[PDB]
Amino acid sequence: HMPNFSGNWKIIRSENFEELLKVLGVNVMLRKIAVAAASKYAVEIKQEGDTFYIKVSTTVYTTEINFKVGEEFEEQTVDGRPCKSLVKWESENKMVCEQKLLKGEGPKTSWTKELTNDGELILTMTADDVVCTQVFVRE
């Protein structure tokens, strides 16, 4: 197995996190405690070919998703609401994920993950017109 998305990642930048949560209707006090918890974002990925295991965690919370590119799966929005998700590739090293809520009305959300040439992992998370960008390095 050669060098791909696979590995353990630790966050180093986190731009527009608060603003994203606001759009997602999170009250001030929780946004701030959330911004605090985000400087300990760890991501572990196992990638085999087309197929992905991803663990995102902070000090007190973790979640795991499993998916194949091109095949619908379920997870939660950043705000916690369950959703149907679909991942597609965009270049050698970027995937994007459109999301439709299971139940109800809310902002259009989506995320991306990309591996840069300097070997950083870059996560984006979009709610409507607001885009949160997070940068990660190998652990």
- Calculate the alpha carbon distances from 75 to 27, 49, 63, 85, 116 in Å: 23, 21, 9, 7, 25
How large is the greatest C-alpha to C-alpha distance in the chain, in angstroms?
45
Contact 34, 58 (CB under 8 A): no
How open is the CA angle 66-8-91, to the nearest 5 degrees?
Answer: 65
How many angstroms separate the CA atoms of 59 and 62, rounded?
8
Total tally of structural domains belonging to the chain: 1
CA dist., res. 31 & res. 29, Å (int): 5
Tell me phi and psi for residue 116, to 5 degrees.
-80, 170
The whole domain housing 3 covers 1-139
Beta strands 42-48 and 109-115, pairing class: unpaired
Alpha carbon distance 26, 60 (integer Å): 19
DSSP string covering the chain:
--SSS-EEEEEEEEESHHHHHHHTT--HHHHHHHHHHGGG-EEEEEEETTEEEEEEE-SS-EEEEEEETTB-EEEE-TTS-EEEEEEEEEETTEEEEEEEESSS----EEEEEEE-TTS-EEEEEEETTEEEEEEEEE-
Q: Which residues contact 36 (CB under 8 A, 6 or more apart)?
A: none
Cα–Cα distance, 117 to 124 (Å, whole number): 17
